[PDB]
Design a protein around this nucleic acid. Structure first.
Length: 855
DNA sequence: GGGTTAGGGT
């Protein structure tokens, strides 16, 4: 056991804290409390009964409206902007199965529609069921909800279906996503929403009385939310005999969903796609005859294969398969050659290249742009080459989606983003390197890693389809068919890779109180040891009690659309009057960063971030300064150039702002704020006290701490070697994308972080420098004692600091009062009065935290 | 000295 810096406090400060805690201690309307005990009192049977009576709107119908809509629909299908829009609908494969679908839904509570790209299931099935109900004089009883995994899908599909009915958005079809909705009319309507929206709406409607039909789309993708929702459907559907659910899926392990709903009827609907034929590594080498020159366990795989194709391909080609380097994207000059080849033969169309990530995308972009081969300089000005990556701007721009300039061929170098999320139309050739990146959690070592892995069979199929939108194409797979038989069917369903604290907490608000029993019923049960880690984290931040029952704090946390830790940090910012910068920190962690990472500008992005960090040594405060600067450029009508100069996505920035206000409105509705504006002066009297902000941030990211021990100033220009290790002892560093990477001379040696992850070493993706006293006040594992002959005060029983007894005894009594205050604020929420008993304890905490302000 | 990809009423 070692000993850290002294945290004893001056006597005058100690005496004023004592006065203020004694003032706090001589203090003597909660609908929320009654709500909370009421949730805890009812068993599941009473829960259902109460929700049936509470959500009763669809027990009511409008016969004069039924009749009106039935009439105008009959009329509008004799007019000629419809009845042309109807011919082109009847060209879709799904419309041929219309009448069977109507009847199959009528006879079964659950059906499944399976169909490939082009089958129109997503646009047609909701219209089929709606127009049917309208024509039968049942309009007002019909409310259809169709889920989508991605926000952009929910918008575009809704817009298209609305056009297909000669309506503007918001009449019979609408959409709802986070913080943005063009809502449909109440009844006889179709609404497209992202799955999360429907999950959150269960809090009020836990058995789905406010919709008549639920369509789940894209379930084959096995997102957490669709996997969650089907599990909840097994609980909901026994009490909802009238509800109709339509599962919808691509042709990837379609049988599992069918099996899971015990055997329900399954439609298979043909697609509309132009033929894309697959080549593999043997076939590409035969047309290109590139030559490679500048464990195995490889040839164990490839040699048995090599010989049953002995007489089908040339002798020199099957030599190059022997090289482990031929498969994947290890040799970028090979893929470069295959792009050069497609430009020559193989008439005109765009080339879509799927590479694993940013680093390797950059290597091929430079080869394509500044080539050292003679053949490539021939092609350089006759390609228009776009990279494609979530962190790069090209996606949010018009060009990559449009056809190239005359005499130019378009080449797109992309990550998996172009498989389903981003879609380009004039692709005819796909180069599928077969390599992608993935995050895996090793439950035993608490190490998240980012590893390069092979794609699955399903992925490769999806990439093939991206060539067959406009005309027939070709898909070049840079691996042998011996590899494809090594590949998995699907990616690992993401429920198995995820932290579970959020779901377990959310389940309690649906009166699913046993997360082990319920989660075991999903299509793939998560590891029960990952459930225990979830419950444990929730017990530690005090959202669940020791027995595992919900606490008043946890119910609030469950009602915030954000992870429970950052929820708690957002909440703390309300009681401690630093609302604006903390919700910026929260929003940027829950969402992504507003900074692009354009190619070749890695050096300059680092300067921009350091400059916006304002030497405050926190990746989180750095985002808030960015938001403060962004608002100012809107006040100066200089937004575009501010965004240009500093590589900022105005789109993510504006969404971060909408998230900040959502948090404000919720905390305001929950009686924690006097004002719903996250910039209100009253909610922000403390927002420039930097030591205070590190304390509230630490209260959120705790217990994820690191301690730094080393220096360097020799001698290149500006870099330093760190010796740093997390609370568990493992040696870490700041990720190069962090503003603290390579920095020197820190006012404190301790940091908190949101994500640790190993790619080339164990990195902290984001950090904020914290001070020990702040950790001690908001953390746990705090005891005072004597170890060498020295009095100490510790945190997490891991970091021990010299501390005299007078300071320790006061800090310990202070933490006691802090816990008492948090416990009441959760049960009996109210804003903290500016001149009350509760403010005196707050002033006690600010007083101790300010002792660390930089002189 | 490095960034696979999606998401959260009123």
């Amino acid at each position: 056991i070692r000993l850290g810096c002294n945290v004893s406090a001056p006597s005058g400060v100690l005496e004023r804290v004592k006065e203020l805690m004694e003032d706090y201690s001589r203090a003597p309307d909660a609908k929320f409390q009654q709500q909370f005990r009421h949730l805890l009192s009812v068993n599941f049977e009473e829960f259902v009964a109460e929700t049936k009576e509470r959500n009763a709107d669809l027990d009511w119908v409008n016969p004069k409206l039924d009749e009106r809509l039935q009439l105008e629909l009959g009329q509008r299908q004799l007019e000629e902007n419809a009845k042309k829009r109807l011919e082109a609908r009847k060209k879709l494969p799904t419309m041929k199965y219309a009448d069977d679908i109507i009847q199959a839904v009528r006879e079964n509570q659950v059906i499944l529609i399976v169909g490939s790209t082009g089958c129109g299931k997503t646009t047609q099935v909701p219209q089929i069921l709606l127009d049917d109900a309208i024509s039968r004089g049942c309009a007002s009883s019909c409310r259809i909800i169709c889920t989508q995994p991605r926000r952009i899908s929910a918008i575009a599909i809704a817009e298209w279906v609305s056009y297909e009915r000669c309506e503007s958005l918001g009449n019979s079809v609408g959409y709802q996503i986070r913080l943005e909705s063009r809502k449909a009319r109440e009844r006889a309507s179709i609404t497209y929403c992202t799955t999360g929206v429907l999950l959150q709406q269960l809090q009020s409607d836990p058995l789905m009385h406010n919709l008549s039909v639920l369509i789940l789309d894209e379930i084959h993708e096995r997102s957490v939310e669709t996997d969650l929702l089907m599990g909840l459907l097994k609980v909901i559907l026994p009490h909802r005999p009238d509800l109709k659910v339509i599962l919808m899926s691509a042709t990837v392990r379609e049988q599992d969903f069918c099996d899971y709903f015990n055997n329900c009827p399954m439609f298979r609907i043909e697609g509309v796609m132009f033929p894309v034929k697959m080549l593999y590594l043997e076939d590409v080498l035969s047309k290109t005859n590139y030559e490679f020159q500048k464990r195995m366990k490889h040839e164990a795989m490839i040699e048995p294969y090599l010989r049953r194709i002995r007489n089908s391909y040339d002798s020199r080609v099957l030599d190059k398969l022997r090289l482990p380097e031929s498969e994947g994207c290890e040799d970028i000059d090979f893929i470069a050659d295959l792009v050069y080849y497609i430009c020559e033969n193989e008439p005109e169309g765009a080339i879509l290249v799927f590479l694993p990530g940013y680093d390797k995308i950059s290597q091929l972009y430079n080869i394509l742009d500044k080539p050292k081969t003679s053949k490539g300089q021939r092609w350089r000005d006759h390609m228009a080459v776009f990279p494609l990556h979530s962190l790069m701007q090209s996606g949010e721009q018009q060009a990559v989606f449009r056809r190239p300039p005359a005499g130019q061929r378009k080449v797109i170098i992309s990550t998996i983003i172009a498989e389903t999320s981003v879609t380009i139309d004039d692709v005819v050739y796909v180069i599928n390197s077969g390599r992608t990146k993935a995050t895996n959690y090793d439950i035993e070592t608490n190490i998240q890693s980012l590893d390069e892995v092979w794609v699955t069979k399903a992925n490769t199929q999806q990439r093939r389809g991206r060539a067959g939108r406009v005309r027939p194409g070709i898909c070049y797979n840079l691996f042998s068919r011996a590899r494809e038989d090594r590949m998995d069917d699907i990616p690992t369903p993401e429920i198995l890779r995820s932290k579970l604290e959020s779901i377990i907490l959310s389940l309690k608000l649906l009166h699913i109180d046993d997360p082990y029993r319920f989660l075991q019923t999903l299509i793939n049960a998560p590891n029960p040891e990952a459930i225990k880690m979830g419950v444990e984290l929730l017990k530690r931040i005090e959202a669940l009690d020791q027995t595992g029952t919900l606490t008043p704090l946890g119910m609030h946390l469950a009602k915030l659309p954000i992870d429970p830790q950052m929820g708690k940090m957002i909440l703390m910012s309300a009681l401690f009057c630093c609302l604006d910068p903390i919700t910026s920190a929260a929003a940027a962690l829950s969402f992504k960063s507003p900074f692009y990472s354009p190619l070749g500008k890695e050096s300059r992005v680092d300067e921009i971030k350091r400059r916006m960090a304002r030497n405050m040594r926190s990746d989180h405060l750095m985002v808030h300064n960015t938001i403060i600067a962004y608002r100012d450029s809107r006040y100066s009508h200089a937004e575009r150039d501010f965004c240009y100069k500093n590589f900022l996505s105005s789109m993510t920035l504006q969404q971060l702002e909408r998230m900040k206000n959502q948090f404000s409105e919720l905390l305001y509705n929950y009686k924690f704020l006097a004002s719903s504006n996250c910039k209100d002066a009253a909610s922000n009297k403390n927002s420039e006290k930097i030591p205070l902000l590190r304390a509230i941030i630490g209260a959120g990211l705790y217990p994820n701490m690191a301690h730094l021990r080393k220096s360097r100033q020799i001698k290149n220009r500006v870099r330093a070697i760190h010796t740093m290790a997390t609370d568990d002892g493992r040696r870490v560093n700041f990720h190069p994308s962090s503003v603290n990477s390579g920095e020197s001379g820190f006012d404190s040696a301790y940091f908190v972080y949101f994500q640790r992850q190993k790619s080339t070493d164990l990195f902290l993706l984001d950090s904020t420098m914290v001070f020990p006293m702040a950790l001690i006040i908001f953390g746990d594992g705090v005891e005072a004692g004597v170890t060498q002959n020295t009095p100490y005060l510790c945190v997490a029983k891991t970091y021990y600091f010299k501390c005299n007894r007078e300071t320790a005894d006061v800090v310990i009594q202070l933490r006691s009062n802090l816990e008492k205050l948090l416990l009441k604020k959760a049960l009996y929420p109210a804003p903290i009065e500016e001149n009350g008993y509760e403010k005196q304890l707050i002033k006690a905490i600010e007083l101790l935290l300010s002792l660390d302000e930089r002189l």
